[PDB]
């Protein structure tokens, strides 16, 4: 059989060993070329319990993205150790899909329960060497470029009744989020989003959040207060730190004239926070040219509140592991020998 176990996972990459893109740079030095022929062994009449909040792989993937970021991005004013003014060149930044894989003596067990919440038992199951590709995008509030749920919008948590544990919302349709910054002031950008797309789905989400809260009134509001990075929508595009006001996205009035394309007042910061550890940093004034990411929204991180006839949900974000958890939910390491 196979006992739940851990092991160091090796990364299948497609990263061509010629690009100065700092993901390619790292993923060539640390990672092998991809599998040409991924095999999947569907294990019949075998049930296995998974847990996305207690899956080891999350921490390994997390180790890498830090390592990757720490060798590739260096702050001109790194406010951690005293007076660090170390070099900050302008290098290529575009996420690439990593495959984490187990050597012989270990398998990756993949769950095929199509509407699987991430924790608890999985009846329909398989075996793999490797995961699907995963882009290590660093973001809060919205999960960009991830996966879609197979059928239904699946709501993920360790404890639904515990308002402390963050809820991962997994979409089934994707929403494009055009995030542009005009060339030639510097510190001001805009994320163009289709309104008629977003609220048709934010509703589909509400009906799902009803299903797990006894048909109570589902209500969104801007983050109750907290660091600029998790109150605003903080992510990275072409080596720049976007900070977008996502208030106009989480609208209740819509879910009625709402069709119109919504746009977020973004503004790129230099004096920023750190998601790796506690402390501040500083990077150079943003690069020139029409900066844009054609990002595809596939998830929402959410925090609840304390209970009468309504339930409040504000945008979550901070535990960047959760991002990897949203992608690694159906996989688990197992020893054979």
């Amino acid at each position: 059989v196979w006992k739940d176990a851990d092991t160091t996972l090796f990364c299948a990459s497609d990263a061509k060993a010629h690009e100065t893109e700092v993901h390619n740079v790292w993923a060539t030095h640390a990672c092998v070329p991809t599998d040409p022929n991924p095999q999947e062994i569907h294990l019949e009449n075998v049930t296995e319990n998974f847990n996305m909040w207690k899956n080891n792989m999350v921490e390994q993937m997390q180790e890498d993205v830090i390592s990757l970021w720490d060798q590739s991005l260096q702050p001109c004013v790194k406010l951690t150790g005293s007076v660090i003014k170390q070099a900050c060149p302008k290098i290529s930044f575009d996420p690439i899909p990593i495959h984490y894989c187990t050597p012989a003596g270990y398998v990756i067990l993949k769950c095929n329960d199509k509407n699987f919440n991430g924790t608890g038992p999985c009846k329909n199951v398989s075996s793999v060497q490797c995961t699907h590709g995963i882009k290590p995008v660093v973001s809060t509030q919205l999960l960009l470029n991830g996966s879609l749920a197979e059928e239904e919008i699946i709501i993920r948590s360790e404890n639904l009744t515990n308002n402390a544990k963050t809820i991962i919302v997994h979409l089934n349709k994707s929403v494009e989020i055009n995030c542009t910054r005009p060339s030639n002031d510097i510190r001001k950008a805009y994320c163009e989003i289709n309104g008629t797309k977003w609220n048709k789905v934010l509703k589909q989400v509400t009906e799902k959040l009803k299903e797990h809260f006894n048909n109570k009134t589902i209500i969104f509001q801007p983050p109750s207060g907290g660091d600029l990075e998790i109150t605003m929508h903080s992510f990275n595009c072409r080596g720049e730190f976007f900070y977008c006001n996502t208030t106009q996205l989480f609208n209740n009035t819509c879910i009625k004239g709402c069709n119109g394309t919504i746009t977020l007042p973004c503004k790129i910061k230099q004096i920023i926070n750190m998601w790796q550890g506690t402390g501040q940093a500083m990077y150079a004034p943003p690069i020139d040219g029409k900066i844009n990411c054609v990002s595809n929204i596939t998830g929402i991180l959410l925090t609840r509140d304390g209970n009468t006839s309504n339930e409040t949900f504000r945008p979550g974000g901070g535990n960047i592991k959760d991002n990897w958890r949203s992608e690694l939910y159906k996989y688990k390491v197992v020893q054979i020998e």
Partner: peptide, 27 residues
Amino acid sequence: XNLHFCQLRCKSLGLLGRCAXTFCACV
């Protein structure tokens, strides 16, 4: 996350402080 900073940070609002990673949150 610097939790005491965060706790005290949000009590300015009348909220409690919570570590959401290495970031400060208020409820």
